[PDB]
Amino acid sequence: NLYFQSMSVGFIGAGQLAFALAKGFTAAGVLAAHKIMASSPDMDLATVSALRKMGVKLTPHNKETVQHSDVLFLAVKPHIIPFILDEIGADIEDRHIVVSCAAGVTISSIEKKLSAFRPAPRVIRCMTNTPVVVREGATVYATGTHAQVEDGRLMEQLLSSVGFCTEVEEDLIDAVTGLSGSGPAYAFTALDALADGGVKMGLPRRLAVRLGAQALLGAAKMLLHSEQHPGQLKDNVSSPGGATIHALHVLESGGFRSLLINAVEASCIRTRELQSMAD
Amino acid sequence: MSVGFIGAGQLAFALAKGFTAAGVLAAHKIMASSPDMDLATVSALRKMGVKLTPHNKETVQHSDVLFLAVKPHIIPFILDEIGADIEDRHIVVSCAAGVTISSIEKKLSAFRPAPRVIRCMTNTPVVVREGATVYATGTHAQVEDGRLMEQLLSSVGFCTEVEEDLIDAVTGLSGSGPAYAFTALDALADGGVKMGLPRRLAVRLGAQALLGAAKMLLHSEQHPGQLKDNVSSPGGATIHALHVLESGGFRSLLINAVEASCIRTRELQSMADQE
Amino acid sequence: NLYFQSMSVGFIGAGQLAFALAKGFTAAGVLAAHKIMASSPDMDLATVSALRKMGVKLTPHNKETVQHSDVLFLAVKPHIIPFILDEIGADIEDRHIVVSCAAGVTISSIEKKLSAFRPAPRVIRCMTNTPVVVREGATVYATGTHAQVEDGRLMEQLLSSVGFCTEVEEDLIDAVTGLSGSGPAYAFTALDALADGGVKMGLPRRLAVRLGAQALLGAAKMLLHSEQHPGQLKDNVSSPGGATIHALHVLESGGFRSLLINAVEASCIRTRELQSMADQE
Amino acid sequence: FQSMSVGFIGAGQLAFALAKGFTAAGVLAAHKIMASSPDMDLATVSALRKMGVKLTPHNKETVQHSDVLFLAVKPHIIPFILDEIGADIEDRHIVVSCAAGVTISSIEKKLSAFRPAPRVIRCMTNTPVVVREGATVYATGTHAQVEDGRLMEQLLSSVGFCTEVEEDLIDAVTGLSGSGPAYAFTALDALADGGVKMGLPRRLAVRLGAQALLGAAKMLLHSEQHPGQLKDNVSSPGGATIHALHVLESGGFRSLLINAVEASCIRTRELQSMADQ
Amino acid sequence: MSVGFIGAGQLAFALAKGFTAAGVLAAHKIMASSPDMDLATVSALRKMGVKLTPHNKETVQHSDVLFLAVKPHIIPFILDEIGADIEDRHIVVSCAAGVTISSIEKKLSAFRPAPRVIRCMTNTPVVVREGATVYATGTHAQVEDGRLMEQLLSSVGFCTEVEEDLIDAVTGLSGSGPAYAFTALDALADGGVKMGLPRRLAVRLGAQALLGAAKMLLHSEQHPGQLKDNVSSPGGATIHALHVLESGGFRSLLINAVEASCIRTRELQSMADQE
Ligand SMILES: NC(=O)C1=CN([C@@H]2O[C@H](COP(=O)(O)OP(=O)(O)OC[C@H]3O[C@@H](n4cnc5c(N)ncnc54)[C@H](O)[C@@H]3O)[C@@H](O)[C@H]2O)C=CC1
Ligand SMILES: NC(=O)C1=CN([C@@H]2O[C@H](COP(=O)(O)OP(=O)(O)OC[C@H]3O[C@@H](n4cnc5c(N)ncnc54)[C@H](O)[C@@H]3O)[C@@H](O)[C@H]2O)C=CC1
Ligand SMILES: NC(=O)C1=CN([C@@H]2O[C@H](COP(=O)(O)OP(=O)(O)OC[C@H]3O[C@@H](n4cnc5c(N)ncnc54)[C@H](O)[C@@H]3O)[C@@H](O)[C@H]2O)C=CC1
Ligand SMILES: NC(=O)C1=CN([C@@H]2O[C@H](COP(=O)(O)OP(=O)(O)OC[C@H]3O[C@@H](n4cnc5c(N)ncnc54)[C@H](O)[C@@H]3O)[C@@H](O)[C@H]2O)C=CC1
Ligand SMILES: NC(=O)C1=CN([C@@H]2O[C@H](COP(=O)(O)OP(=O)(O)OC[C@H]3O[C@@H](n4cnc5c(N)ncnc54)[C@H](O)[C@@H]3O)[C@@H](O)[C@H]2O)C=CC1
């Protein structure tokens, strides 16, 4: 991997996503823990000290991170992005590749901020999720106006080391946020509820969590490796008159499917609001 | 070691495919039997190298480990057909939902005393070697019988021994669970399509998100609520979506499901035990 | 062993919050009641009657409070605040710290009014709740433009004597209002209902109120003193197949969680919406 | 509580919670407690171990050690336990059953086949004894001495509120204060979600919501006033609180908490009507 | 007669398959074009005999009847690309949902006056020659243009002329309608499976019942309520099931669907017309 030979990486914002990618990247063995830098105005958080246990260099000053970094991740709340771009924008050299992870924030807003300091800022927008921490992430990215082709290919190689990754048009990223960005939280809620179900029927809680998580993992893997439609796989499991089809009825009766549609839609719609509450 | 399957449908194919993929069993040392020797699962096992037959008696004579993978109401008819063919060497592994070790031991004890019986509940993801399997050892299962089953089935997913009275609840949880996930994924994909994603991409991303979250939980020392907290940034998109799931009673629906599947499982065995 | 010997406290407004804070400050020992003065236009209030028993000095004239006080709590309704500021703005001195407890009212609107009379007024915005009265309040505060560093430390010192207190950014305070400011009323509603349930299943009302409140108190204390997620503590009570997991299910079937999220949201939105119509007017 | 020896049959969540509370209170030396379980691998067993509690796989050893013996196993284990160690219950023992649903009557039936006057007490407590803010009730059996009830009240009062009740109230208490902490933890998790939705950091929103519930409960305990009156004092006309109370009312918030207490009480009586038959 | 398709996806395959099955068009006289000349619909048309190309201009030059079967937001880009290639001989048939005759005529009138434009709304069952199709003739459509389109499309299903302002409502009804039916059938099949039927049999019987009822209504002079009456015997099984549909507001859900699809169709065209 000549891409990652001597590449440095930095994070502005040292929160949940910064730790997850740093944990993912280092576990994948694509980068050394000391070759990554993160910043936060609060070195007192949990994420900050976990990153330090990793051996990640931590500083309070975002201008330190930009100086040390080839690829620069922006891992801060959406409304901070233009505040950060004012602060470090005169420090963005032509060598930098600025990868924005903030939900909603458009390539255009970032480029307008940085194109006032140097004409051709190299910007990539990305939407990832926390399972990169076990190298099973789901990632999309869109390339900006001045991103060279090697920048898209480096980004793919880097983010494929921690999970699935593909390029998309930027107009899809809000919807991806609602689906795979927020998706893991839908899954954690589901697994907690399924374990409550297991407990209600007599199972020890530890066992019920394990069995629920394994069933969801196995089922998602089955879908990824099958050519068959989701409903065909459901049919394979649903014996006539059986326990499973009886359970599927009660899911249907509460509008189970519509709740997951509602969830993707509400996250996507909130992601658009977060962007226009910047423009 | 020689393994047999009575019933050559969905579950037989999943386990045999997983065993052979795992490298713990060679397809030629596996024999499976079914009457309608024309079903699609039959052909899938035949293109796989499994030995096939319409005679349940030939499967018994060929195997040391004998899986029962027929619909639960068929188990008694099978135990009658082959009960006289069971030898000392056999381990009988019932995969049937609801069917008790007691009921199997009572039908097979009329032919030879001390049948070695194991009850398991598994699920279809054994096909990709990510199944969830529990098992209970029967009255006459020796020590090496439970250790062998756990070794064999650990090769196609998670596997642990349980007291038999947990198994109907496991059935509602990890037995039916993949169908809950398949439903969830079809719906998440519809959500992704509603918001502008192509179906193909939406299916892939939804499935990858469920898999990754599941792997995270399994590999973490943390409560699923705590992992939920990390994803849901303050004022953010995730916590907005979580609210609409809560407003629908999302959690209660999953509790309802596990319960309904467990209760149906007991109900079915009750009708079996009534006769 | 805290005590502010050179500090005189005043309250403009002598209703629920002022009584709650005066009662808590005095029970904490940090403030003798006679070093506290409160003012209200209705000297025949139950709260004014209560404050009089504690020894607090009472007056109808707000200027009197301002002239006596160093730390000046604005404890009137949000829409009264601009009239209060117009009346006593010319009486604010350098020595004053103005602590606004009004829901929604920004530091900016207070500072703009008072800056017309004397530049650089020292303003602190505060969100607290009634349990300060038993010294278990939840308080956040934000420091204004001209508040010294010792002003915030002093206010955190003082408000810490009656419960939890921390500094926050001002743009979090409307959300705190939705959670801990309105939070006691959610709890009172919950305890009335749980007691109703205890009565339905055959408990005497008095016992059912006691047990319910003790259960909420103990659980909240457990969470405050644990490093564990609330779901984990919940799991320790929910024995497999037991009574508790059966009750959790019916709570889940009603959307219990979403109602509490709805409540926090509704209180915060209303807090923003009151302020925004004050700003226009 | 001079030199009392305490035992728990069952080394699970409640056994840990009470042992933690009693040693926190300083009423018991950890090493004067003995707990038994057939699975010495559990996390509760490791925590008890680190506390200094004596652990053993043999229930008979717990019994011989104890003066006060707590039964802290699942309700349906209780008859298996009494069969097993029933011949080892001595006249000096006070047997305290913590199991939801199990009646004094059913315990005395099993035990009096061995000695004629087993001293039995039934209680319902909850996990906040761990921070000495438990809510505990107890009822005295046929042969419990007057001193036995006073001893038990003194012991349980050191880790929270404790009062004697008639036994016919204990299933209802189970639904209220026994299961109550779980309802509170659910409430707190949801209040924090709401705080996060409106823009608070998770840690701060957990802290403030917990502080709010604790302070409100304490207010009501120290007030001679109806909880509706206290609610009135919080909600200013046209204000934020009264808007939030409305959306709670529109979802039937009150009725859900009533359904909860009722469902847990009814389940508790089912956990006994199954054992009895 | 030579027919062309710009866009070679779901709808192009359905219509071409139906036309050739019908015998009104030979596959070799049909040309279709797409950029991603790799999609599965592309291969299905290639195994069919349709002529294929990545150049939209070649489709125009080859056809007399030119169908537009691209996603609605692509229509303007296409009208720009080929507007200069349109000749007097062409009939332009837009299949795009929402897209108005006005908007197409305005883009093509900038190159040659009086373009012959037809707007239709069709659906996927044209693939089995049972589609539902309406059409509106444009400003410069001669008389033989509307009669030709009706002849061509009557061969793959029902076809009638409508005023253009009904077409967005038709889209919510018969355009999206097959998806409502597919959903209904998956669910009826689940119902059949819950009550003991094998999935395969349940799918077949459900689909046959919907088809037969639909044919009955189309071939009867009677109100659908009256046909409902004949099936529901007094005290019987049908009227019990109808009650549970009514208690769920079954009818209102279908009204909601048609409305939601119609409204989304107008909304989308509004965003198009805004720019
Ligand atoms: N948490 C998740 O699962 C995902 C989050 N994201 C995005 O990542 C960004 C952060 O997500 P989280 O890490 O969850 O937020 P987080 O708040 O845990 O981390 C954000 C960090 O930024 C720090 N920060 C605040 N002001 C700063 C400043 N002026 N300069 C530098 N650092 C500053 C804060 O101290 C905080 O720790 C958001 O934009 C979110 O949309 C994207 C994908 C998934
Ligand atoms: N499909 C699933 O998701 C799971 C299934 N199981 C259990 O495994 C068993 C079957 O599961 P599936 O394979 O899904 O059912 P299936 O219907 O695919 O397999 C049934 C097989 O039994 C065969 N059969 C019928 N009568 C027979 C006889 N007299 N002798 C021999 N074979 C006979 C049929 O020909 C068919 O091949 C059931 O007891 C079910 O509870 C366990 C857990 C999950
Ligand atoms: N009660 C609560 O739970 C909390 C109250 N607050 C805030 O504190 C303020 C008041 O709280 P409450 O005491 O509940 O209101 P309250 O209505 O109980 O007392 C209000 C006081 O304002 C007095 N007042 C009216 N006009 C006045 C004037 N021109 N000059 C002086 N006093 C005047 C009234 O006579 C009364 O004594 C409000 O802004 C409220 O948002 C904040 C947190 C919690
Ligand atoms: N956890 C709670 O919040 C409360 C529980 N209780 C009651 O306390 C009892 C247990 O509560 P948890 O500790 O939650 O159960 P738990 O399941 O956490 O612990 C149960 C203990 O019993 C042990 N055990 C199993 N068989 C045994 C045997 N034959 N001999 C000795 N020990 C054996 C288990 O290994 C485990 O250590 C139940 O009856 C429950 O109703 C009462 C009030 C509150
Ligand atoms: N699928 C259905 O049920 C019905 C579809 N329609 C309409 O027909 C049109 C397409 O329907 P589908 O075929 O389902 O969409 P589809 O996505 O299957 O076909 C779209 C085709 O457009 C092609 N395309 C994209 N850009 C192009 C360009 N610049 N030049 C040429 N071809 C290009 C794509 O490669 C793809 O083959 C839409 O306007 C839709 O409203 C009408 C009624 C029902």
Short mmCIF file of C-alpha atoms in Angstrom, two decimals, chain A residues 236, chain B residues 5-17 32-45 48 52 68-71 124 126-127:
data_model
loop_
_atom_site.label_atom_id
_atom_site.label_comp_id
_atom_site.label_asym_id
_atom_site.label_seq_id
_atom_site.Cartn_x
_atom_site.Cartn_y
_atom_site.Cartn_z
CA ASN A 236 -37.05 -19.59 3.88
CA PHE B 5 -29.68 -35.77 8.06
CA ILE B 6 -33.28 -36.95 8.16
CA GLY B 7 -35.15 -34.24 6.31
CA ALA B 8 -33.30 -32.56 3.42
CA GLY B 9 -34.78 -29.07 3.36
CA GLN B 10 -33.79 -25.55 4.45
CA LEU B 11 -32.00 -26.49 7.67
CA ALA B 12 -30.16 -29.54 6.33
CA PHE B 13 -28.72 -27.49 3.47
CA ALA B 14 -27.66 -24.65 5.77
CA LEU B 15 -25.81 -26.92 8.22
CA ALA B 16 -24.19 -29.13 5.59
CA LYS B 17 -23.05 -26.09 3.60
CA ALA B 32 -29.28 -36.78 3.80
CA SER B 33 -32.72 -38.26 3.12
CA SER B 34 -36.14 -36.96 2.04
CA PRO B 35 -39.26 -38.45 0.38
CA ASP B 36 -39.90 -35.72 -2.18
CA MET B 37 -36.40 -36.31 -3.59
CA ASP B 38 -37.13 -33.47 -6.03
CA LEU B 39 -37.17 -30.35 -3.81
CA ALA B 40 -34.76 -27.53 -4.59
CA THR B 41 -32.90 -28.02 -1.31
CA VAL B 42 -32.33 -31.62 -2.42
CA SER B 43 -30.61 -30.49 -5.62
CA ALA B 44 -28.53 -27.92 -3.72
CA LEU B 45 -27.20 -30.72 -1.51
CA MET B 48 -22.62 -30.00 -3.08
CA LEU B 52 -28.67 -38.48 -0.94
CA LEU B 68 -33.30 -34.73 12.84
CA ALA B 69 -34.26 -31.85 10.54
CA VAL B 70 -37.92 -32.48 9.73
CA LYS B 71 -40.93 -30.36 10.62
CA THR B 124 -30.17 -20.39 9.03
CA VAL B 126 -25.00 -21.36 9.90
CA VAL B 127 -24.93 -21.22 6.10
#
